Design a protein around this ligand. Structure first.
Ligand SMILES: CNC(=O)CN(CC(c1ccccc1)c1ccccc1)C(=O)c1cc(C)c(=O)n(C)c1
Length: 110
Protein backbone atom coordinates (compact mmCIF):
# COMPACT_ATOMS: atom_id res chain seq x y z
CA UNK A 1 0.00 0.00 0.00
CA UNK A 2 3.13 2.26 0.42
CA UNK A 3 4.21 4.22 -2.73
CA UNK A 4 7.33 1.99 -3.18
CA UNK A 5 5.20 -1.21 -2.77
CA UNK A 6 2.70 0.19 -5.38
CA UNK A 7 5.74 0.47 -7.75
CA UNK A 8 6.70 -3.17 -6.84
CA UNK A 9 3.06 -4.30 -7.48
CA UNK A 10 3.13 -2.54 -10.92
CA UNK A 11 6.41 -4.36 -11.81
CA UNK A 12 4.86 -7.71 -10.65
CA UNK A 13 1.74 -7.12 -12.87
CA UNK A 14 4.05 -6.33 -15.86
CA UNK A 15 6.21 -9.49 -15.26
CA UNK A 16 2.92 -11.55 -15.27
CA UNK A 17 1.47 -9.66 -18.35
CA UNK A 18 1.06 -11.08 -21.93
CA UNK A 19 3.76 -8.49 -22.98
CA UNK A 20 6.52 -10.75 -21.49
CA UNK A 21 4.77 -14.21 -21.62
CA UNK A 22 7.22 -15.56 -24.32
CA UNK A 23 10.09 -15.61 -21.70
CA UNK A 24 8.21 -15.17 -18.33
CA UNK A 25 6.24 -18.49 -18.47
CA UNK A 26 8.92 -20.71 -16.75
CA UNK A 27 8.71 -18.33 -13.68
CA UNK A 28 4.86 -18.28 -13.32
CA UNK A 29 4.67 -21.27 -10.90
CA UNK A 30 7.01 -23.21 -8.56
CA UNK A 31 9.46 -25.62 -10.29
CA UNK A 32 7.75 -29.07 -10.06
CA UNK A 33 11.04 -31.01 -9.59
CA UNK A 34 9.34 -34.48 -9.37
CA UNK A 35 7.16 -33.82 -12.50
CA UNK A 36 10.32 -32.83 -14.52
CA UNK A 37 12.54 -35.65 -13.06
CA UNK A 38 14.85 -33.00 -11.44
CA UNK A 39 15.54 -35.23 -8.37
CA UNK A 40 18.55 -33.02 -7.33
CA UNK A 41 16.63 -29.65 -7.54
CA UNK A 42 15.73 -29.35 -3.78
CA UNK A 43 19.31 -30.51 -2.83
CA UNK A 44 20.79 -27.59 -4.90
CA UNK A 45 18.00 -24.93 -4.38
CA UNK A 46 17.32 -24.46 -0.60
CA UNK A 47 14.86 -21.50 -1.10
CA UNK A 48 12.65 -21.95 -4.21
CA UNK A 49 10.87 -18.79 -5.50
CA UNK A 50 8.51 -17.98 -8.42
CA UNK A 51 6.11 -15.18 -9.47
CA UNK A 52 2.94 -16.93 -8.08
CA UNK A 53 4.66 -17.01 -4.62
CA UNK A 54 5.73 -13.30 -4.97
CA UNK A 55 2.08 -12.49 -5.94
CA UNK A 56 0.64 -14.41 -2.91
CA UNK A 57 3.13 -12.60 -0.57
CA UNK A 58 2.22 -9.16 -2.11
CA UNK A 59 -1.57 -9.91 -1.78
CA UNK A 60 -1.01 -11.04 1.90
CA UNK A 61 1.00 -7.79 2.63
CA UNK A 62 4.01 -10.05 3.52
CA UNK A 63 6.52 -7.54 1.96
CA UNK A 64 7.14 -4.60 4.36
CA UNK A 65 9.31 -2.68 1.79
CA UNK A 66 10.56 -2.69 -1.86
CA UNK A 67 13.94 -4.26 -0.78
CA UNK A 68 12.15 -7.41 0.58
CA UNK A 69 10.10 -7.74 -2.69
CA UNK A 70 13.25 -7.30 -4.89
CA UNK A 71 15.17 -9.93 -2.80
CA UNK A 72 12.46 -12.57 -3.68
CA UNK A 73 12.42 -11.62 -7.43
CA UNK A 74 16.27 -11.81 -7.56
CA UNK A 75 16.25 -15.11 -5.54
CA UNK A 76 13.96 -16.56 -8.29
CA UNK A 77 16.54 -15.55 -10.99
CA UNK A 78 19.57 -16.65 -8.85
CA UNK A 79 18.01 -20.16 -8.34
CA UNK A 80 17.66 -20.44 -12.17
CA UNK A 81 21.34 -19.31 -12.71
CA UNK A 82 22.53 -21.76 -9.95
CA UNK A 83 20.66 -24.93 -11.07
CA UNK A 84 20.75 -24.71 -14.93
CA UNK A 85 23.72 -24.82 -17.34
CA UNK A 86 24.32 -21.23 -18.57
CA UNK A 87 23.47 -22.22 -22.24
CA UNK A 88 19.95 -23.57 -21.30
CA UNK A 89 17.00 -21.70 -22.96
CA UNK A 90 15.50 -21.07 -19.43
CA UNK A 91 18.68 -19.05 -18.48
CA UNK A 92 18.29 -16.88 -21.66
CA UNK A 93 14.62 -16.28 -20.61
CA UNK A 94 15.68 -15.50 -16.97
CA UNK A 95 18.22 -12.88 -18.25
CA UNK A 96 15.52 -11.23 -20.47
CA UNK A 97 12.88 -11.10 -17.66
CA UNK A 98 15.51 -9.88 -15.12
CA UNK A 99 16.43 -7.06 -17.61
CA UNK A 100 12.69 -6.03 -17.61
CA UNK A 101 12.68 -6.20 -13.76
CA UNK A 102 15.99 -4.34 -13.08
CA UNK A 103 15.30 -1.40 -15.51
CA UNK A 104 11.78 -0.77 -14.06
CA UNK A 105 12.87 -1.43 -10.41
CA UNK A 106 15.59 1.26 -10.96
CA UNK A 107 12.74 3.83 -11.60
CA UNK A 108 11.70 3.43 -7.88
CA UNK A 109 10.11 6.68 -6.57
CA UNK A 110 12.22 8.38 -3.80
C1 LIG B 1 5.13 -24.71 -16.78
N1 LIG B 1 6.32 -25.54 -16.75
C2 LIG B 1 7.54 -25.04 -16.59
O1 LIG B 1 7.74 -23.88 -16.25
C3 LIG B 1 8.70 -25.98 -16.86
N2 LIG B 1 9.98 -25.42 -16.46
C4 LIG B 1 10.77 -24.79 -17.53
C5 LIG B 1 11.39 -25.80 -18.50
C6 LIG B 1 12.55 -26.56 -17.85
C7 LIG B 1 13.76 -25.92 -17.59
C8 LIG B 1 14.80 -26.61 -17.00
C9 LIG B 1 14.65 -27.94 -16.65
C10 LIG B 1 13.46 -28.58 -16.91
C11 LIG B 1 12.41 -27.89 -17.50
C12 LIG B 1 11.84 -25.12 -19.79
C13 LIG B 1 12.00 -25.87 -20.94
C14 LIG B 1 12.45 -25.28 -22.11
C15 LIG B 1 12.73 -23.93 -22.15
C16 LIG B 1 12.57 -23.17 -21.01
C17 LIG B 1 12.12 -23.76 -19.84
C18 LIG B 1 10.26 -25.36 -15.14
O2 LIG B 1 9.46 -25.71 -14.28
C19 LIG B 1 11.57 -24.82 -14.71
C20 LIG B 1 12.71 -25.60 -14.40
C21 LIG B 1 13.84 -25.07 -13.92
C22 LIG B 1 15.02 -25.91 -13.53
C23 LIG B 1 13.93 -23.64 -13.72
O3 LIG B 1 14.94 -23.08 -13.31
N3 LIG B 1 12.79 -22.90 -14.04
C24 LIG B 1 12.85 -21.45 -13.82
C25 LIG B 1 11.65 -23.48 -14.52
Amino acid sequence: LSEQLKHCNGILKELLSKKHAAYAWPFYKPVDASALGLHDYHDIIKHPMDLSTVKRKMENRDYRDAQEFAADVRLMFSNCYKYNPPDHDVVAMARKLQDVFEFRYAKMPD
